[PDB]
Short mmCIF file of C-alpha atoms and ligand atoms in Angstrom, two decimals:
data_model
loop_
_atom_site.label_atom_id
_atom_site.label_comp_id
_atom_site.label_asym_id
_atom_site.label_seq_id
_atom_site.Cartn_x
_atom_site.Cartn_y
_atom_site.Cartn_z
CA UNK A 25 32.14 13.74 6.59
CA UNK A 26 32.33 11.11 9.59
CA UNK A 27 35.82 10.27 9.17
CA UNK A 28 36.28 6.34 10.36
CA UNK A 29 38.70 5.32 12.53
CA UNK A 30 39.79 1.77 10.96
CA UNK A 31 38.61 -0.57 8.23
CA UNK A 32 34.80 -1.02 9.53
CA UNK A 33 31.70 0.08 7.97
CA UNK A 34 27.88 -0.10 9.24
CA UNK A 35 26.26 -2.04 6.97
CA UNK A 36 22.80 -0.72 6.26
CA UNK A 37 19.63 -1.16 6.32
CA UNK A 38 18.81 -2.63 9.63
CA UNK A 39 15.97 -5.38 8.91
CA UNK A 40 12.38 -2.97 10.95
CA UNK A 41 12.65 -3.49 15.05
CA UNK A 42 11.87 -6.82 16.06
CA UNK A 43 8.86 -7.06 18.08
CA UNK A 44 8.70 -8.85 21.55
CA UNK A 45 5.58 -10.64 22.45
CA UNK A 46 3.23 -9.24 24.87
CA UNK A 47 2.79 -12.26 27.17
CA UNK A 48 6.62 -10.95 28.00
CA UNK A 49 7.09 -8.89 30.66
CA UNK A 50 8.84 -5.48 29.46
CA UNK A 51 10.71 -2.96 31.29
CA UNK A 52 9.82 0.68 31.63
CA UNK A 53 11.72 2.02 28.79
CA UNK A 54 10.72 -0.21 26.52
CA UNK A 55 7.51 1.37 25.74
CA UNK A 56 9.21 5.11 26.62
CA UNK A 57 9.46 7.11 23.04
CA UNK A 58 13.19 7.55 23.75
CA UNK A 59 13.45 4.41 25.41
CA UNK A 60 14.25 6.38 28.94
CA UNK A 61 14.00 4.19 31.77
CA UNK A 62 12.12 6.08 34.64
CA UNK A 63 12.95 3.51 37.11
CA UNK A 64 17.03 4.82 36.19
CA UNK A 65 15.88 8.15 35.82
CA UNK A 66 14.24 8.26 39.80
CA UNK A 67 17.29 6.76 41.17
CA UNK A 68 19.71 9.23 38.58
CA UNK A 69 22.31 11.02 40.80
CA UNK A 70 22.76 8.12 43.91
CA UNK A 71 25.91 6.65 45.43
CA UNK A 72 23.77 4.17 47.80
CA UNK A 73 23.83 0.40 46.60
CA UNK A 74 21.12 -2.33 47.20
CA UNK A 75 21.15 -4.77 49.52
CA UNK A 76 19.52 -7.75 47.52
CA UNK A 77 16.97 -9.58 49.57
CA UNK A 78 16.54 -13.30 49.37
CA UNK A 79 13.75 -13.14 46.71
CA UNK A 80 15.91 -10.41 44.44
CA UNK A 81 18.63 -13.11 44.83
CA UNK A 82 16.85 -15.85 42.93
CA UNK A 83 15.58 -13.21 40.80
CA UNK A 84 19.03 -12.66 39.51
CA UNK A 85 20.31 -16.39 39.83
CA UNK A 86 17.39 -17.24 37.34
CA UNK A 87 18.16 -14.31 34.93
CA UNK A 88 21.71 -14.41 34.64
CA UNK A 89 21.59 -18.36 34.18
CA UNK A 90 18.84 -17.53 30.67
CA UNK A 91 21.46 -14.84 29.84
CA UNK A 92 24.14 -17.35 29.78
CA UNK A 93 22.03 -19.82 27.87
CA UNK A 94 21.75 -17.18 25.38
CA UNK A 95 25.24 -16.25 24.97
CA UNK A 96 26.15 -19.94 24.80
CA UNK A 97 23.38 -20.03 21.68
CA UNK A 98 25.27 -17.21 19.81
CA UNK A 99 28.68 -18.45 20.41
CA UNK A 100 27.87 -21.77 18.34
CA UNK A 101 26.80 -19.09 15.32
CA UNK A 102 30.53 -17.40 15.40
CA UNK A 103 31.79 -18.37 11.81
CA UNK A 104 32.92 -16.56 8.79
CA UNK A 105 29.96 -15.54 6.55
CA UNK A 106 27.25 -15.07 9.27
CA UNK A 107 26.17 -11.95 9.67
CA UNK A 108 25.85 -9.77 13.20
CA UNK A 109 21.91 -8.99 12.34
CA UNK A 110 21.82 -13.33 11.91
CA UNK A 111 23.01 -13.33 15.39
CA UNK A 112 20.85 -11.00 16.49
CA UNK A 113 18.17 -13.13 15.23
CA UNK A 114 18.51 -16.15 16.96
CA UNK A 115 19.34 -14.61 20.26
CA UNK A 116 16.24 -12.51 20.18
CA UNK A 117 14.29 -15.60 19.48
CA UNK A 118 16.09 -17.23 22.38
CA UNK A 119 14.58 -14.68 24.80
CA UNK A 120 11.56 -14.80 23.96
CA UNK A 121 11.82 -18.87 24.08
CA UNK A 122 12.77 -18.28 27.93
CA UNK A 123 9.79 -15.90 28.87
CA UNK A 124 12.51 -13.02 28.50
CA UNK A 125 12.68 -9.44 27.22
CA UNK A 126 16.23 -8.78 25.33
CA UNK A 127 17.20 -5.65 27.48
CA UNK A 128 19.13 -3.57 24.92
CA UNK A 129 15.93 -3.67 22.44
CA UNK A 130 14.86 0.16 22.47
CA UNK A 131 16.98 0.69 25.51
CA UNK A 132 17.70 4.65 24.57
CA UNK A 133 16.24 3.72 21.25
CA UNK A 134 19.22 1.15 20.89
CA UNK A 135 17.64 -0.45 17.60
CA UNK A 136 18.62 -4.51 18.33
CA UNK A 137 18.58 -7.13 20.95
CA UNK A 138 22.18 -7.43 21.65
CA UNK A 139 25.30 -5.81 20.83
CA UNK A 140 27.74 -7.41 18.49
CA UNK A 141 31.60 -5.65 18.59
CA UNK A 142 33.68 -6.11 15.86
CA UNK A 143 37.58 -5.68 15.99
CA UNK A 144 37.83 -1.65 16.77
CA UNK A 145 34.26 -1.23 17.97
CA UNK A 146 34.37 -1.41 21.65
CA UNK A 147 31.46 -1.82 22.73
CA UNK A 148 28.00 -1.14 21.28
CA UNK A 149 27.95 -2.30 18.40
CA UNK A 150 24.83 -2.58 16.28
CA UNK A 151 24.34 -6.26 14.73
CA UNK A 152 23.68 -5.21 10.54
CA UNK A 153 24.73 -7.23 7.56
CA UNK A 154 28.07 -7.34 7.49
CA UNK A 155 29.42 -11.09 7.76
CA UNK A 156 31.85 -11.96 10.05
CA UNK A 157 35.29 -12.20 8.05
CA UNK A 158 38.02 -15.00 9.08
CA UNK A 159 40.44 -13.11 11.71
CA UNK A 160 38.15 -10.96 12.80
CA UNK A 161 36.95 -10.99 16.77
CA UNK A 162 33.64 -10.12 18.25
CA UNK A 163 32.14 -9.64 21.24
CA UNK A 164 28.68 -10.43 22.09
CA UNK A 165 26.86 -8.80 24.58
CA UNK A 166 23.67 -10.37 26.04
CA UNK A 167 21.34 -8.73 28.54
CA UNK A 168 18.54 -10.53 29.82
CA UNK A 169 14.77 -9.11 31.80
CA UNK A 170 12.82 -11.59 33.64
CA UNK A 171 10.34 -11.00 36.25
CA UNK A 172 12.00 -7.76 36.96
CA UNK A 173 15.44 -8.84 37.04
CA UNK A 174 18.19 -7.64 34.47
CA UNK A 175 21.20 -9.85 34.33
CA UNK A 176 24.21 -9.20 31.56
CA UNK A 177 27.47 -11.05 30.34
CA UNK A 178 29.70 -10.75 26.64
CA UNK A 179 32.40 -12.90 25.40
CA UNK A 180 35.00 -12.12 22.66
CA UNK A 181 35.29 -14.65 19.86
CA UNK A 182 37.48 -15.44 17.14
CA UNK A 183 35.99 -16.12 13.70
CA UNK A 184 38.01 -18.59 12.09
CA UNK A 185 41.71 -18.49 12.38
CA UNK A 186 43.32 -15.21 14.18
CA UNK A 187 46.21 -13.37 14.53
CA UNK A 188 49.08 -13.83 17.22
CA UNK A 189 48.04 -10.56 18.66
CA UNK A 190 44.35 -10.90 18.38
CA UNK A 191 44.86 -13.60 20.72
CA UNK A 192 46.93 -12.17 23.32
CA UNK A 193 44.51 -9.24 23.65
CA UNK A 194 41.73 -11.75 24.24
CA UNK A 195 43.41 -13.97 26.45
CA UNK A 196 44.47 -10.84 28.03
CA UNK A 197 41.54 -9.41 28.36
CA UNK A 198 40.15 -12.84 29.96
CA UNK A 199 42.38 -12.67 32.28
CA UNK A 200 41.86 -9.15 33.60
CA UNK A 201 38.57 -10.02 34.62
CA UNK A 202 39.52 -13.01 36.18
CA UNK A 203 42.08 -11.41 38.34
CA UNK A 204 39.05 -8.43 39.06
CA UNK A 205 36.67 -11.34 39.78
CA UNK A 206 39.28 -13.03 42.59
CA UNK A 207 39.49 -9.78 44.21
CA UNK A 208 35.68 -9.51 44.97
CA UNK A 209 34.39 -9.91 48.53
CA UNK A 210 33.41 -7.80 51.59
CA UNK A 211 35.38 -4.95 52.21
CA UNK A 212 36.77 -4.38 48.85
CA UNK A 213 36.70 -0.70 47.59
CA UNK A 214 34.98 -0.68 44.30
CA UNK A 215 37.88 1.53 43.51
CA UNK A 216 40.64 -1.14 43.77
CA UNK A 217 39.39 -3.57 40.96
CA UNK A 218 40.82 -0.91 38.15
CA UNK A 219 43.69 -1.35 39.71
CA UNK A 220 43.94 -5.20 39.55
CA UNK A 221 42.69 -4.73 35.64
CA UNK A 222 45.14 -1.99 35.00
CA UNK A 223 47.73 -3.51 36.20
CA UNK A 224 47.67 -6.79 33.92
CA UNK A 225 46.76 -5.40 30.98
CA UNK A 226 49.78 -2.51 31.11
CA UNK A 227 52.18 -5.08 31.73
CA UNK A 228 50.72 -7.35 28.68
CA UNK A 229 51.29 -3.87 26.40
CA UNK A 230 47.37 -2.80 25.97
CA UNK A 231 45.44 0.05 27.31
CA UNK A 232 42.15 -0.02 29.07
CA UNK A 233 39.19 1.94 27.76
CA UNK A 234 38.03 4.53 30.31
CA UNK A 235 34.90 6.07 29.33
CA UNK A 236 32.72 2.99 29.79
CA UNK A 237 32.72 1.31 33.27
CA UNK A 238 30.76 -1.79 34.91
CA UNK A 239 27.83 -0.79 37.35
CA UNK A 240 25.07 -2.24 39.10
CA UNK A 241 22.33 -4.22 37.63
CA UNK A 242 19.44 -5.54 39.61
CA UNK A 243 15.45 -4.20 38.71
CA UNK A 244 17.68 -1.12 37.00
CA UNK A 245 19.60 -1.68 33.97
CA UNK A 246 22.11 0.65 35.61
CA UNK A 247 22.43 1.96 38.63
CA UNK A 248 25.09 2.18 41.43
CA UNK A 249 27.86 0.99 42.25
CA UNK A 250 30.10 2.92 39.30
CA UNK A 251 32.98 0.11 38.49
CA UNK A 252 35.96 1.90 36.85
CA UNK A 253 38.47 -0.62 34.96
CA UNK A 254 41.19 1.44 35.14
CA UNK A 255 44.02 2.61 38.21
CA UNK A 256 43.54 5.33 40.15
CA UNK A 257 39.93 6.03 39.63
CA UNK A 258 37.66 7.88 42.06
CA UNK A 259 35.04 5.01 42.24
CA UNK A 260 33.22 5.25 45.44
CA UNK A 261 31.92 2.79 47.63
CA UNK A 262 32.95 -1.02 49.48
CA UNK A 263 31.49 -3.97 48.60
CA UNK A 264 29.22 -5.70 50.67
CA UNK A 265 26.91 -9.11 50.97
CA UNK A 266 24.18 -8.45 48.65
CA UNK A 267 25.75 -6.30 46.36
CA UNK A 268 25.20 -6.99 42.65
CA UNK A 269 27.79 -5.46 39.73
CA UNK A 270 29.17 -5.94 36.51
CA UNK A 271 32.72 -6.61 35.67
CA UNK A 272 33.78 -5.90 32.16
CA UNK A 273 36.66 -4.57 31.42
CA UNK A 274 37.11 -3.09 27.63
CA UNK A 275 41.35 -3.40 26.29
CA UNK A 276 42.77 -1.89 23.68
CA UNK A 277 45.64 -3.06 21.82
CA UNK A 278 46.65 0.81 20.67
CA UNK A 279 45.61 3.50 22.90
CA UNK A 280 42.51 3.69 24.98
CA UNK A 281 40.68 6.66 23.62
CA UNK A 282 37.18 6.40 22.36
CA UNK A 283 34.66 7.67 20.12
CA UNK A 284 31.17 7.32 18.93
CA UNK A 285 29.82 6.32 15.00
CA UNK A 286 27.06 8.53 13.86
CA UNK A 287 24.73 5.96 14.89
CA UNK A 288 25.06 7.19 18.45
CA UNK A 289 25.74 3.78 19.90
CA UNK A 290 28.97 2.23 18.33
CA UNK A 291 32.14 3.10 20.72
CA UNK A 292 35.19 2.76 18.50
CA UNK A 293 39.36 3.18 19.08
CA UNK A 294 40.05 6.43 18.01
CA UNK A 295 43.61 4.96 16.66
CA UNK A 296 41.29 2.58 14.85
CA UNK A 297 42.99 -0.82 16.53
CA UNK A 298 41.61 -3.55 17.78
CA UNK A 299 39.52 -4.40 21.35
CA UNK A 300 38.04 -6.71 23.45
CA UNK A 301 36.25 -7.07 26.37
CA UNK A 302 34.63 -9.99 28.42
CA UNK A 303 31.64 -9.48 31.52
CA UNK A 304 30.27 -10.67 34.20
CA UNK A 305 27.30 -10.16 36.70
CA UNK A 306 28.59 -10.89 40.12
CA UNK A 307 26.96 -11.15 43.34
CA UNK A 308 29.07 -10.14 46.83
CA UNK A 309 28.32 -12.98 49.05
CA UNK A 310 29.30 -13.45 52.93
CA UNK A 311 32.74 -14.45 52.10
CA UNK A 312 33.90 -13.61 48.05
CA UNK A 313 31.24 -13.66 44.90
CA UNK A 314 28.73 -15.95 43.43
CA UNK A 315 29.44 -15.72 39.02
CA UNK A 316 26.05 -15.32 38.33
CA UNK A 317 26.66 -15.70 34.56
CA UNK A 318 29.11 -18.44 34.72
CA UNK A 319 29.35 -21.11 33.05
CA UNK A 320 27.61 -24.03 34.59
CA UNK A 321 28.81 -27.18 32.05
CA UNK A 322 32.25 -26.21 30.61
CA UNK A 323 35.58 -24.75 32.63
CA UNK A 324 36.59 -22.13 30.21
CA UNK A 325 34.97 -19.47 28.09
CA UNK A 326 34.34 -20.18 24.21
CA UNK A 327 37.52 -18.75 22.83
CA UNK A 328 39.32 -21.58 24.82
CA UNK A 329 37.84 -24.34 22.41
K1 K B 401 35.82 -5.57 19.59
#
């Protein structure tokens, strides 16, 4: 009796948990039962943000530089015929190849090592055996832990040749996080990047998803700030030097109303159409933001090609 919302299906059984070496360091919840991270649950409840320190700054440099070499590995996988749980292969083998734990591996018992978004899934998606048809797009979501340090990024992709409107709502939803990014530096309400994203994405014809927002990442997963990507949100707080946040703004090319699969994890349209998002990890520095996930050899993201 789950009633889906478009033309996806999970595509089950999910290959057993893939286990992480112990020479690699693992964070808290990944040895909780229910994968609850104390180290979020002490801080649950706070508005303050962290000033990163010096040392916490090259902790995330390094980590969000692995996390990009990882997304860069899955991006040259994007074809028709592979399969999500194929992706999720290779990048969990690309961790552990740079001394890293896959964050979203038992992460409240999320069962992979990255999340793989199909066409109406949002976000959260769990990589299975279902290959990637021509026309489809995905998003792949990569989350990094190294000495500490949790660092976190996604592209959209096309597979193959795509639609007219599955590009605009990429290129759309490229460009809303662009236009966020620009608008990062001291002084900035948290509040006002929702705006920026709103803004662009209403005027291209798409909705922004509102139940998911960006957030702090440093030695938590999550934690404060609370990043909105919609107008007229209540986020509190002003950036500041040594603040570290995510930027990832979720679009919807019907409406912008969510729901979960069964599965507990998969965020889907509720109209069933198609979304996209694209991330960054950014760093507030004395004068406008360092992209800690950036790109460091090629101008554009991969669905520029
Ligand atoms: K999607």
């Amino acid at each position: 009796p789950y009633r889906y919302t478009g033309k996806l299906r999970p595509h089950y059984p999910l290959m057993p948990t893939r286990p992480v070496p112990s020479y690699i360091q693992r964070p808290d919840y990944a040895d909780h039962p229910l994968g609850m991270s104390e180290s979020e649950q002490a801080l649950k409840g706070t508005s303050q943000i962290k000033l990163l320190s010096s040392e916490d700054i090259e902790g995330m440099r390094l980590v969000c530089r692995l996390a990009r070499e990882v997304l860069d590995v899955a991006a040259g996988m994007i074809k028709p015929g592979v399969t999500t749980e194929e992706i999720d292969h290779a990048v969990h083998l690309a961790c552990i190849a740079r001394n890293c734990y896959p964050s979203p591996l038992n992460y409240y018992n999320f069962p992979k090592s990255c999340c793989t978004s199909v066409n109406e899934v949002i976000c959260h998606g769990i990589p299975d055996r279902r290959p990637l048809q021509e026309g489809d797009i995905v998003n792949v979501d990569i989350t990094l832990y190294r000495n500490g340090y949790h660092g976190d990024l996604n592209e959209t992709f096309f597979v193959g040749e795509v639609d007219d409107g599955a590009r605009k709502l990429v290129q759309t939803t490229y460009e809303c996080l662009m236009q966020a990014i620009d608008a990062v530096k001291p002084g900035v309400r948290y509040r006002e990047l929702g705006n920026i994203i709103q803004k662009h994405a209403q005027a291209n014809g798409f909705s922004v998803v509102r139940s998911y927002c960006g957030h702090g990442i440093h030695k938590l997963f999550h934690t404060a700030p609370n990043v909105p990507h919609y107008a007229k949100n209540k986020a509190v707080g002003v950036m500041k030097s040594g603040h570290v946040f995510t930027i990832e703004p979720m679009i919807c090319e019907g409406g912008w109303q969510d729901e979960t699969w069964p599965d507990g994890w998969t965020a889907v349209t509720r109209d069933g159409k198609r979304s996209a998002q694209f991330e960054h990890t950014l760093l507030v520095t004395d004068t406008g933001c360092e992209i800690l996930t950036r790109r460091l050899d090629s101008a554009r993201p991969h669905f520029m090609s």
